[PDB]
């Protein structure tokens, strides 16, 4: 779950596209019943039930891929307070960085 796992272009950092691509792959593997959404049971250990509600604007109890990717973007921004478009190893290790990793691993 280090930088290298999420950095296909070998610049040493994760950009928003790289985080989103990893988030999409994580979404797909976290939805084995192929309904196109993630519920609290599927996200256990990564996103708590309390945090899921905050990420689900239409309050249907699940996250579709668009909602999940929006959550990835919000967590990327939260882990990148210098607003420089990339997450480095220091930022990935931060508490906010760990929450990004839990969405995209
Ligand atoms: Nd990169
Ligand atoms: Nd599902
Ligand atoms: Nd929803
Ligand atoms: Nd940065």
| Count: domains in the chain | 1
Ligand minimally distant from the alpha carbon of residue 71: 3
**74 class by beta-carbon count within 10 Å (0-12 exposed, 13-18 middle, 19+ buried):** middle
Ligand minimally distant from the alpha carbon of residue 29: 2
Q: What is the resolution of this structure in A?
A: 1.0
Domain ranges, residue 19:
1-105
Number of residues that this document lists for the chain: 105
DSSP result, the chain: --GGGG-TT-SSSEEHHHHHHHHHHHHHHH-TT-SSEE-TTTTTTTS-HHHHHHT-TT-SS-EEHHHHHHHHHHHHHHH-TT-SSEE-HHHHHSHHHHHHHHHH-
Compute, in angstroms, the gap from residue 56 CA to the centroid of ligand 3.
5
Known binding residues are 7, 9, 11, 13, 18, 31, 33, 35, 37, 42, 56, 58, 60, 62, 67, 80, 82, 84, 86, 91
Determination method here? X-ray
């Amino acid at each position: 779950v280090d930088i290298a796992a999420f950095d296909p272009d070998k610049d040493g950092t994760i950009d928003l596209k790289e985080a989103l691509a990893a988030g999409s792959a994580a979404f797909d593997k976290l939805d084995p019943d192929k309904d196109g959404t993630l519920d609290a049971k599927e996200l256990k250990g990564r996103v708590s039930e309390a945090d899921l509600k905050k990420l689900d604007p239409d309050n249907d109890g699940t996250l579709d891929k668009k909602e999940y990717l929006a959550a990835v973007e919000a967590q990327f921004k939260a882990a990148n307070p210098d607003n420089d478009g990339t997450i480095d190893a220091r930022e990935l290790a931060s508490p906010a960085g760990s929450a990004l990793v839990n969405l995209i691993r």
